[model samples]
Target: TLKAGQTQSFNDWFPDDNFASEVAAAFEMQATDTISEEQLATLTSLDCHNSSITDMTGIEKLTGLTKLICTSNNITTLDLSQNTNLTYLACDSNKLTNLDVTPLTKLTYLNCDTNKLTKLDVSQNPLLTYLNCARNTLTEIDVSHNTQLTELDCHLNKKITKLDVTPQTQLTTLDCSFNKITELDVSQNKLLNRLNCDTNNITKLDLNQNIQLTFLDCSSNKLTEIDVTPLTQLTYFDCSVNPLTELDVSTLSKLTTLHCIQTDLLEIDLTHNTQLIYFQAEGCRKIKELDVTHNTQLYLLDCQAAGITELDLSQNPKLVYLYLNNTELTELDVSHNTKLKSLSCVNAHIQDFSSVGKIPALNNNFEAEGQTITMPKETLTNNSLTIAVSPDLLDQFGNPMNIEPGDGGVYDQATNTITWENLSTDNPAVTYTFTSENGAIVGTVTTPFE
Candidate 1:
């Protein structure tokens, strides 16, 4: 109902009145509440959401427009057959049941997240970079011809069971989280960095070749086990709520963040890693010892509810945040640690607390059964200890606990004790036993060998 030379303005439409008259003059129009032919001819962007307009016939005249955001409206039909300069168009949460985008060749971004559309023909939009057409009734979408597409998020569509991305090679981030998709092939997209294909019916996936991936969230799927041996450079991985029992860490040892919580992993060995920072393996009820002792740069470790009995943080010198609540732990020693900031051990069976000293920040719930000792930092020289026992006791355990007792085991009195390291503990059950010799029962022990 706009006049031929009238113009209208609203919030964010004309934030300042300094350019109000200039803008209207550029569109060849006066001031009005509704659109006119003169205003449409010079319009560069149009937004008519939640208006009494029911159709898009007024927008056909705006051929110079570049952006159009008409969402949450009662418009039933839109015809972009006249506009050619449009680059960004969003019409989500509308009652429109059908769309014909064959004319929008210059459209680069489209967001139809919550609509009733069935199918789209984006095989012509070559310059498109972002697309979001999720939560629709789409049974299929063939985006194999969109080569320049970069970001595509089409989740919560229950009718799509197959998705092929052989042509979308430039895609960096793809998220199809909730859908009826049973199979997806993304091996062709080598430059993918972030992918979220969770909550689907997919049973098998091969990401062993995606080396550029950094963040991957495939939780709540039907995958039995995935071979991530090729994702060596990955940083963040979340495979929770899946049916995986064991995950191979020989490839993901360089990962800084690994989220395999609620899986069925029994044991995880990260002995070769040195840069791992965050690790969460919670809800793996049968998991025992998590040997992240080699990850020296670990900052956050969460083994909550993983049925872990003993935790060995003797090697992780940079651990800052630790959560081992609801696990089977008898003792926790953080006395040698000086960088720990936060700790949570609520609802755990802790029997001893000898090494839980005064840290910088301690956020823990105590059962009050054992005592924790706080020792002051002392600067002492390297003390050496020497013990004399029979050399026959060393050959009992096939060695001197530090030397081979049988043939190359026993050390002479003039031997170099500075180059020897004892592998025996003081425990009686598993201690190394040596045999007694002549008068001296000759055995020697030294501490801190260089």
Candidate 2:
């Protein structure tokens, strides 16, 4: 208990030896028996952070204090009703279980992060512009009355289900990541520049009215659909790990970075995003076409497992890394991309590698399909050379060839080669041909048979 007209010793209430001595010396009081109310009333600021002073009994008498910073202490409870003139308070990284700022209506900034606070009521602080109550056990928070708030960081509060920011129209930055929030509405805040609501249970988000947004990260949410057409000024956007069916960024011409990996996006059109530098849309198996012909400024692109049938990167000459594993692409044309450094085209129906130049990093089990095969030449003697035919050789009817003398040639099924013997040597050389099942000549060998 504190008395009005009595002198108090610093060692009487404080456990640490230097705590009271330092506090008395800073206020120009005697260290032996400091006058608590008389010396504290004239002071306008107090900083007792990390002083090992567990009991702050004489602090209630400092009614004239405007600033209080007592962070990184073992304080469990703090009452600032007497310091109503305080505009700034920073009690973060402490053991505070409860705090009441209802009487401090003049507060403009408050930071009480890394505490054991279960609930906080700041409705009376209408002039607050910034508040950080992160890393706590808060189940709910009400900042609707703080219309002047520009920034709020209440992340890492796992049990928080709802957050109402409708009254805070002047907010420019808000981060509510790593929580259990199911829904969020920031439509009233038009001046918002950066928002990170990652790792939440949000299913839908409406930012159509916020045209001034520049950076947005709504990743690791349950978002099935999102419309960012109205945000034309956005530069960096990441909506990865969602179930979105389609995304259209054709209107965002200034977009530079986009990461929408592991989603259900069927298609993405970035014809208008000419300023894009990095793009990734991996694991979206429904995509059929990805046209990056207009993205000439692209440096890195990864569209792995998107099932894209055709990909034409002839216009992206500045590409450095290209990953297209497990796609439906039959032909890849990267001849124009001389700056290409890395390529991953596994499990694809790729039939063309003529355009792909000597790349430093290549990964693929390439099969030489749809290529021409030439037969070896043979010299015939005595004007009668026997031609050996393969048994696997098929005729026009797809049957085993039984070539005989009357059939104009003898086909040896055992050797899988055709033998033409007893041929008229009217000319210097005679040509013998072997054809496929469709009668298309596969190979021809010159012989001198009479």
* Reference-based TM-score of each model: 0.68, 0.69
Candidate 2 regions with alpha-carbon error over 4 angstroms: 1-39, 46-58, 309-450
Kindly list the per-residue Cα lDDT of model 2 for residues 132-238, writing each as its tens digit.
99999999889988999999999998888898898889999999988999989898988999898988999999999889899989999999899999999999999
Put down candidate 1 lDDT per residue, 299-393, tens digits, no spaces.
88889877766788888878777777767664566665567776666554442343443463442322222111122222222332232332322
Candidate 2's displacement at residue 85, Å, is 1.9
RMSD to the true structure for each prediction, in A, is: 15.4, 13.0
Please report, as a residue range, the 10-residue window in candidate 2 with the lowest summed lDDT.
365-374
Write down the RMSD of candidate 2 (Cα, Å).
13.0
Q: After superposition, how far is residue 142 of candidate 2 from its true place, in Å?
A: 1.3
Reference-based lDDT, each prediction: 0.66, 0.75
Scored against the true structure, residue 132 in model 1 reaches a CA lDDT of 87
Summed over model 1, clashes come to 13
